[PDB]
Design a protein around this nucleic acid. Structure first.
Ligand SMILES: Nc1nc2c(ncn2[C@@H]2O[C@H](COP(=O)(O)OP(=O)(O)OP(=O)(O)O)[C@@H](O)[C@H]2O)c(=O)[nH]1
Ligand SMILES: [K+]
Ligand SMILES: [Mg+2]
Lengths: 69, 65, 116, 194, 61
RNA sequence: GAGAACAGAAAUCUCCAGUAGAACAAAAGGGUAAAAGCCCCCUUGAUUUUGAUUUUCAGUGUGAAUACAAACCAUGAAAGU
């Protein structure tokens, strides 16, 4: 990183120095999963996250608030 | 000693309701149960929110929630 | 009718079942409805106490508090960063008339309610 | 004073949770083939532009500061300012499947049917009336094994008339305890089989 | 809507308060579509509280 | 493998060689050697307590179990576990 003189003191100028390794991969062979395995591997736990509920929010103070229409 | 029997009915024949005679702490967001389904009674005059707490160190007493 | 019998109903839909459990009531329903006639004491011919009235037992309990180091530890603490966040948030709130308070968060409001 | 505003025809996308930047612009085969000696310069310039864009996004991300001093748990001190990375956008397969929900055991089904609430489990210390001490109700120096150490045991009236009269009652109670423990283990194995 | 916001409470109660002769009993009768609370032009007709079941989860007082 | 009164096929001490052929768990087709083996020191707290969060229950709905996280706790010079 270097001083930029045009992005202020927040956005430095970037430079890259290669350190290796440099590699060229030719794509020889493939083997793809079955779609049920794809879905099983992309399932999410959802245990940690709070359940969403309509018209119910949490404010900055942490109070649970309900909306009335 | 803890509970008092509260009789209901015109002829006072039912005796399934109980009243707590000691002081209680009910907490925040307390709402009374509907009277038909209210077995345990904690009257509002006996509910407490604060106490006089004495600290052993420094020898003071403070009124705390 | 054999199909209308209580035995046949259970096939369609031993010691666990209680008295009065039928098509209309489950066990919990039976006990909740028996609450309205529960509070009576039982006495025999001689006048002894077969069973005391509900919530009217006369036995004196052994009221003791055991020694434990959980009594002497801090139960609630708040960081300086959290205090600053809640102090800033108290003041930025824009109350809407159509929002109701469902549950109030437990906070040290004595430490948060500082006004110049 | 080189510029820090990389302009790109096709707008690039970011996954700041994975610290990745993806550009789908046009790449020529001639400038990237091994027959070209400037392929390294072209690739370095393209990667430099993409890294500049990614660094701009990262340094424009919100920052967290704290007031706690060093030597405390947490890892962030007062002088450290930390970027708040968002959740990763790119989806990747897991290494193991999600933990299955275990089926209810026989005790759990019976407790649900009969309305038995779980015990509060405050502690393992019970008060002993015969002494003036609190003792563990089970385990190391527990109160469930005091009959073995009891100095005097009265012989039950019902044991008489059977050949098990000569047996030490402490031995009999230890055998009953071990039988109960093995019964509990067999019930656990049965639940695991079911 | 209030019942849905308190769906974990198994029932909610709505208490009608206000000045005498403002129409609390009339409003409750309107909601029930039946004369379940006594109504009069003279103030002070209602003298004690009264529970009315509007729905399975909604009570009026 | 050699040396040392009782003391030899088996007691205890000393030296050299010693990839683990010992002792711990799993059933490696590559587990562990300034150890994951043996001894010593510190802790007996391990069923802590907080949660607007996950699942279940309740006529006692701001409670309890339960999952997860955090604050602590133990030890160590520390990294850290
Ligand atoms: N025009 C008109 N009259 C109403 C309305 N609501 C109530 N009233 C009349 O106002 C009078 C008061 O009725 P109540 O229902 O007894 O009012 P309340 O508040 O319950 O009075 P109390 O029970 O005595 O405390 C009645 O005679 C009603 O007929 C309304 O919406 N419009
Ligand atoms: K009236
Ligand atoms: Mg009225």
């Amino acid at each position: 990183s270097y001083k930029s003189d045009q992005g202020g003191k927040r956005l430095p100028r970037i430079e890259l120095v290669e350190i290796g390794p440099r590699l060229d991969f030719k794509i020889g062979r493939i083997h793809t999963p079955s779609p049920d395995m794809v879905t099983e591997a992309h399932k999410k736990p959802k245990q940690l996250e709070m359940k969403t509920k309509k018209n119910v929010e949490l404010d900055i103070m942490g109070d649970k608030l309900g909306r009335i229409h | 000693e803890m509970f008092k029997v509260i009789k209901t009915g015109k002829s006072r024949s039912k005796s399934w309701k109980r009243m707590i005679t000691k002081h209680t702490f009910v907490g925040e967001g307390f709402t009374r149960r509907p009277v038909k389904m209210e077995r345990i009674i904690r009257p509002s005059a006996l509910r407490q929110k604060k106490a006089n707490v004495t600290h052993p160190e420094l020898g003071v007493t403070v009124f705390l929630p | 009718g054999t199909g209308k019998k209580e035995k046949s109903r259970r096939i369609r839909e031993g010691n666990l079942r209680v008295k009065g459990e039928n098509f209309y009531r489950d066990s919990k329903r039976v006990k909740f409805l028996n609450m309205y006639t529960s509070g009576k004491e039982i006495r025999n011919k001689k006048g002894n106490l077969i069973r005391a009235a509900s919530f009217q037992d006369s036995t004196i309990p052994d009221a003791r508090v055991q020694p434990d180091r959980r009594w002497f530890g801090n139960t609630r603490v708040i960081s300086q960063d959290a205090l600053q966040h809640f102090r800033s948030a108290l003041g930025e709130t824009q109350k809407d008339t159509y929002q109701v308070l469902l549950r109030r968060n437990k906070l040290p409001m004595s430490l948060l309610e500082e006004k110049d | 004073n080189l510029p820090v505003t990389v302009e790109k025809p096709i707008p690039v996308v970011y996954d700041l949770g994975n610290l990745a930047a993806f550009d789908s612009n046009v790449l020529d085969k001639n400038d990237l083939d091994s027959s070209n000696a400037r392929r390294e310069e072209k690739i370095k310039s393209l990667t430099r532009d993409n890294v500049q864009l990614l660094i701009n996004q990262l340094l424009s991300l919100p920052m967290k500061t704290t007031t706690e001093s060093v030597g405390g748990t947490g890892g962030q001190s007062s002088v450290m300012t930390l970027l708040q990375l968002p959740d990763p956008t790119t989806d990747l397969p897991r290494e193991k499947p999600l933990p299955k929900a275990k089926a209810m055991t026989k005790w759990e089904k019976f407790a649900a049917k009969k309305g038995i609430k779980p015990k509060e489990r405050a502690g393992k210390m019970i008060y002993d009336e015969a002494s003036g001490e609190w003792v563990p109700k089970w385990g190391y120096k527990g109160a469930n094994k005091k009959l073995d150490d009891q100095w005097l045991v009265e012989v039950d009236d019902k044991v008489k008339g059977t050949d098990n009269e000569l047996i030490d009652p402490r031995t009999l109670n230890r055998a009953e305890r071990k039988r109960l423990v093995k019964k509990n283990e067999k019930q656990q194995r049965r639940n695991m089989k079911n | 809507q209030f019942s849905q916001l308190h769906t974990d409470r198994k029932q909610i109660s709505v208490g009608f308060i206000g000045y005498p002769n403002t129409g609390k009993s009339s409003i409750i009768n309107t909601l029930r579509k039946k004369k379940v609370c006594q109504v009069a032009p003279i103030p002070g007709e209602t003298k004690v509280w009264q529970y009315i079941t509007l729905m399975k989860r909604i009570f009026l007082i």
